[PDB]
């Protein structure tokens, strides 16, 4: 029970499940994008996104962090911290 | 090799000494040599002893 | 303006390792610790433990056990071969007894 | 009870309620489709009075929401098998050996693994090389006579490592 | 027997005229030689005791205890370094010679014939233990520990002398056979009640019974390891040995006058097993465990069945080995961290991965794992007390359950779940402590195979 | 380029102690068992006869096993 994770792979999987989400566009979907400034979605659907990451990868993230991710790059960084992603 | 160290040889000498003195004390306690009703045979065949 | 003491700052926690990585139990004298290991095993197990195990595994009949086994065998065989009931009660002879009277 | 501030806020309190109610609705509801329906219904129920300029009616509705939530929770809320309370709770803690060990080995095994221990020795020289001056100066330099916070500033000054990092970096890998 | 007395004397000037790095091999080697020398003793057979003089003799109660003492000395002597090896040479020599004089009066005490000689050698057993625990008591209340110790043991053991002199000048001499072969029953006058109360109460103090068990815990938490092992194993089972001898007299009134002490022992056994479930200071849990096992011993002594005496002496020897071992492991943990508390030193399944095997083995012997001797003892005592009364088995089984739980809590509290990761000073296990564990738990399993030796006179 | 580095406590002191323990029990565990095997394969235990007429034994010549 050890499939190897990598940074490009986790980036692709997180961007896949963000692009599959409804009320964003596949055009203006950047890695360095805000969940507050440019995507314009609210805190509620932001924590729906946080729930999507928790339900995909298989672990909770605490609410001391769920205040303050707000961008996909720090999402990738935080699952990189939970998983310690090197071979 | 005795005068090399005499410190290490002391307690077997002491054990043999205590053993010999217990032999001498039990031989001083040589009453009822055959006078029991349960352990009584004749002195046989050579020399007059049943325990020493 | 006062201390009440004058001694060393204490203690100095000596790791007994990190000067001898091959070290046995006690302090950093290198040879005599190996001598301590050799004496506490060779004169503590190699001459005490297995020899004591043989010496106490068998010895004569402690509290007359198998003597009593074979003696009871012969006595019950006698008391079957001469008809009288085995283990006669009243172990002392009632002819040699005197009850005080009323 | 949190490291950042002295309280959460009203906003994050409502938010944690939403996360808990949504998680309990997962634990209540199998088959995932009626789950998705009821989750959108719960989203609409919070959409009914999101834009109250009032505050006291908002927190009173928060308290009544907690009452209807605690009446309607689940006996086994669906805790993930990595969370505390869950199935794992440091499941492979058998091999989570701290790294102040592995230097108390006999030099035979230090000859068995030479390059790792050479690089570990230069890690420890990196640790001691910048331990006193920069780290203790940045700790006794910035804050007030009372610290009054549980964060700590980085070493943005010029060079070396942010302070108090050793037992943060050198942790077990959480699956050995 | 003087063949055992006089080399124990001649092991003392050995320690004086050996030098630095020279006392140690001499003392340890020669004490192991004396262990073989008393392993030679076991000859005892059939009809009676065996008389090693007009002055000394050995009952078969005395043979395994005497062999246990001469086994326990070199183990103890190796155990009592690394906490005094950095002290002075003359003080170290004084410590070793104190232990040798201590063992000498223990052999004097176990091989007694007359009860007055037994009493003199009883308090001669007392006086080195005092000096050891007070000089190396290693904590701030060794003062109060030694003071409580000596005043409890003397002031309990003081009228015992008067009662024995009264028996001396009302029934002739005090050889154990002439205490036997001539003893007549003594009726229920109140002077007989006070005489029985004096003798039995002095040894009650020395067991301890429940109303006088706070003698013990200060005297073990503020003692060095050598005096603690001496005190626990040899002194408590020596008190049991003394009551086992002197209970031959005064059987026609012990039935009428033994009712409060049994009930005190039973309810206090339950209370003591309860009190060692929740305390800190891990060293003291073994002490209250010892109070629990000695309460079971006292139940076994005051009921007067041969079943009871066989179970009593087996419980004595097995609990002596268990308590001495477990004190040595607690000293190992205190050598690791300078705490003595329970909740601090944690983890240690990862680190020192075979120290935990010895903790597990000691904890399961204290559980009374079933081939061991401790279950043999406890089981025959439960059988004899159920023949005593059809009701006391509630207390015995509830003792068994709470004993299981606190022994297991001792196991999985300090050595299970998570290291506190601010320790970072504990060394990997030395060869010495592993050798001490191996000297403990080879003879316990080897007697677990063949236990027909250690049963008492009523074999 | 796959394998990683486990962090063990130690192997040296532990395996050294147990190697010394098996060696220092085995050094007189083997010749004593060989000796008692030679005893009960050569020297004989005893036979089950009775007391001869007009002859007293020692306090030995009483026991089954010869080493006892
Ligand atoms: C299980 C049972 C669960 C049902 C709960 C009952 C329904 C009660 C409600 O409708 S919620 C009670 C109070 N609701 C509030 O919205 C209080 C004020 N909250 C807000 O204004 C928030 O939506 C915020 C501050 C805009 C959140 O911003 P984020 O998004 O940037």
From Swiss-Prot, chain E:
Q: Which reaction does it catalyse?
A: a ubiquinone + NADH + 5 H(+)(in) = a ubiquinol + NAD(+) + 4 H(+)(out)
Which domain of life, per UniProt? Eukaryota
The main enzyme category here is translocase
Q: In its UniProt record, which GO terms are filed under biological process?
A: electron transport coupled proton transport; mitochondrial electron transport, NADH to ubiquinone; mitochondrial respiratory chain complex I assembly
Q: Which GO terms describe its cellular component?
A: mitochondrial inner membrane; respiratory chain complex I
Q: What is its main location?
A: mitochondrion
The EC number on file is: 7.1.1.2
Q: Does the keyword Transmembrane apply?
A: yes
Keyword annotations of the record: Electron transport, Membrane, Mitochondrion, Mitochondrion inner membrane, NAD, Respiratory chain, Translocase, Transmembrane, Transmembrane helix, Transport, Ubiquinone
Q: Where do transmembrane segments lie in this chain?
A: 22-42, 60-80, 98-118, 147-167, 196-216, 224-244, 256-276, 284-303, 308-330, 351-371, 391-411
Record keyword Transport present: yes
| Localization per record | Mitochondrion inner membrane
Q: Which GO terms describe its molecular function?
A: NADH dehydrogenase (ubiquinone) activity; ubiquinone binding
What InterPro entries has UniProt attached to this entry? Answer: NADH4_N, NADH_Q_OxRdtase_chainM/4, NADH_UbQ_OxRdtase, ND/Mrp_TM
Give the record's membrane topology.
Multi-pass membrane protein
Show the NCBIfam families listed in the entry. Answer: NDH_I_M
Quaternary structure and interacting proteins, as annotated: Core subunit of respiratory chain NADH dehydrogenase (Complex I) which is composed of 45 different subunits.
Q: Which family does it belong to?
A: Belongs to the complex I subunit 4 family.
Summary of the function given for this chain in its UniProt record:
Core subunit of the mitochondrial membrane respiratory chain NADH dehydrogenase (Complex I) which catalyzes electron transfer from NADH through the respiratory chain, using ubiquinone as an electron acceptor. Essential for the catalytic activity and assembly of complex I.
* The protein's name in its UniProt record: NADH-ubiquinone oxidoreductase chain 4
Report the gene name: MT-ND4
């Amino acid at each position: 029970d050890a499939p190897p994770l990598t940074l490009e792979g986790i980036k692709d999987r997180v961007l896949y499940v963000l692009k599959l989400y409804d009320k964003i566009d596949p055009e203006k979907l950047s890695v360095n994008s805000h969940f507050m400034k440019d995507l314009g979605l609210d805190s509620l659907d932001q924590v729906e996104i946080i729930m999507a990451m928790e339900d995909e990868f298989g672990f909770e993230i605490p609410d001391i962090d769920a205040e303050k991710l707000m961008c996909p790059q720090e999402i990738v960084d935080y699952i990189a911290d939970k998983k310690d992603v090197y071979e | 090799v005795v005068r090399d160290h005499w410190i290490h040889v002391l307690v077997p000498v002491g054990f043999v000494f205590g053993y010999y003195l217990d032999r001498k004390n039990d031989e001083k306690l040589a009453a009822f040599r055959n006078k029991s009703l349960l352990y009584k045979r004749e002195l046989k065949p050579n020399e007059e002893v049943t325990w020493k | 303006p006062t201390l009440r003491w004058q001694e060393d700052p204490e203690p100095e926690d000596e790791n007994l390792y990190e000067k001898n990585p091959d070290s046995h139990g006690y302090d950093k004298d290198p040879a005599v610790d190996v001598w301590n290991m050799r004496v506490v095993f060779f004169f503590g197990f190699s001459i005490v433990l297995v020899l004591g195990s043989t010496f106490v595994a068998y010895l004569p009949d402690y509290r007359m056990q198998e003597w009593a086994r074979r003696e009871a065998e012969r006595l019950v065989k006698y008391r079957e071969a001469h008809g009288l009931p085995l283990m006669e009660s009243n172990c002392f002879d009632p002819s040699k007894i005197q009850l005080p009277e009323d | 009870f949190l490291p950042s501030a002295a309280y959460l806020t009203h906003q994050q309190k409502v938010l944690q309620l939403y996360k808990r109610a949504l998680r309990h609705l997962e634990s209540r509801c199998v088959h995932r489709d009626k789950y998705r329906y009821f989750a959108c219904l719960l989203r609409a129920r919070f959409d009914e009075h999101k834009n109250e300029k009032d505050m006291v009616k908002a927190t009173q509705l928060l308290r009544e929401a907690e009452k209807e939530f605690w009446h309607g929770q689940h006996p086994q809320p669906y805790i993930f098998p990595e969370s505390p309370g869950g199935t794992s709770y440091e499941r492979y803690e058998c091999y989570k050996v701290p790294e102040w060990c592995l230097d108390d080995w006999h030099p035979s095994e230090k000859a068995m693994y030479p390059d790792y221990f050479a690089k570990r020795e230069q890690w420890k020289k990196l640790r001691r090389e910048s331990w006193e001056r920069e780290v203790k100066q940045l700790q006794e330099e910035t804050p007030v006579g009372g610290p009054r916070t549980e964060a700590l500033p980085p070493a943005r000054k010029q060079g070396d490592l942010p302070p108090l990092w050793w037992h943060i970096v050198t942790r077990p890998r959480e699956r050995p | 027997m003087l063949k055992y007395i006089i080399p124990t004397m001649m092991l003392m000037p050995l320690t004086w005229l050996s030098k630095n790095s020279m006392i140690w091999i001499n003392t340890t080697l020669h004490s192991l030689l004396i262990s073989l020398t008393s392993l030679l003793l076991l000859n005892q057979f059939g009809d009676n005791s065996l008389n090693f003089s007009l002055t000394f003799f050995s009952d078969s109660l005395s043979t395994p205890l005497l062999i246990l003492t001469m086994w326990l000395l070199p183990l103890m002597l190796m155990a009592s370094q690394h906490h005094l090896s950095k002290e002075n040479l003359a003080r170290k020599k004084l410590f070793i010679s104190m232990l040798i004089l201590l063992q000498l009066f223990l052999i004097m005490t176990f091989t007694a014939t007359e009860l007055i000689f037994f009493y003199i050698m009883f308090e001669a057993t007392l006086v080195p233990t005092l000096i050891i625990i007070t000089r190396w008591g290693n904590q701030t209340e060794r003062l109060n520990a030694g003071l409580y110790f000596l005043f409890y043991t003397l002031a309990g053991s003081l009228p015992l002398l008067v009662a024995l002199i009264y028996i001396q000048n009302t029934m002739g001499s005090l050889n154990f056979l002439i205490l036997q072969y001539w003893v007549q029953p003594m009726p229920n006058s109140w002077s007989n009640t006070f005489m029985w109360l004096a003798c039995m109460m002095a040894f009650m103090v020395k067991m301890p019974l429940y109303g006088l068990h706070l003698w013990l815990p200060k005297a073990h938490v503020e003692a060095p390891i050598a005096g603690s092992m001496v005190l626990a194993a040899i002194l408590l089972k020596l008190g049991g040995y003394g009551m086992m001898r002197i209970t031959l007299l005064l059987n026609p009134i012990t039935d009428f006058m033994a009712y409060p002490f049994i009930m005190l022992s039973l309810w206090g056994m339950i209370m003591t097993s309860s009190i060692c479930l929740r305390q800190t200071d891990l060293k003291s849990l073994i002490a209250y465990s010892s109070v629990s096992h000695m309460a079971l011993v006292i139940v076994a002594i005051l009921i007067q069945t041969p079943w009871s005496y066989m179970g009593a002496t087996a419980l004595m020897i097995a609990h002596g080995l268990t308590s001495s071992m477990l004190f040595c492991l607690a000293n190992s943990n205190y050598e690791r961290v300078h705490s003595r508390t329970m909740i601090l030193a944690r983890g240690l399944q990862t680190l020192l991965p075979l120290m935990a095997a010895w903790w597990l083995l000691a904890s399961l012997t204290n559980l009374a794992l079933p081939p061991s001797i401790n279950l043999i003892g406890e089981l025959f005592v439960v059988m004899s007390t159920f023949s005593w009364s059809n009701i006391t088995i509630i207390l015995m089984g509830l003792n068994m359950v709470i004993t299981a739980l606190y022994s297991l809590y001792m196991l999985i509290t300090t050595q299970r779940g998570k290291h506190t990761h601010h320790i970072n000073n504990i060394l990997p296990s030395f060869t010495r402590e592993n050798a001490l564990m191996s000297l403990h738990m080879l003879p316990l399993l080897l007697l677990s195979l063949n236990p027909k030796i250690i049963l008492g006179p009523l074999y | 380029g796959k394998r990683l580095f486990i962090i063990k406590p130690s192997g040296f002191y532990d395996k050294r102690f147990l190697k010394l323990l098996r060696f220092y029990i085995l050094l007189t565990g083997i010749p004593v068992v060989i000796g008692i095997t030679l005893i009960n394969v050569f020297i004989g235990e005893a036979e089950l006869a009775e007391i001869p007429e007009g002859y007293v034994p020692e306090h030995w010549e009483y026991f089954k096993h010869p080493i006892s």
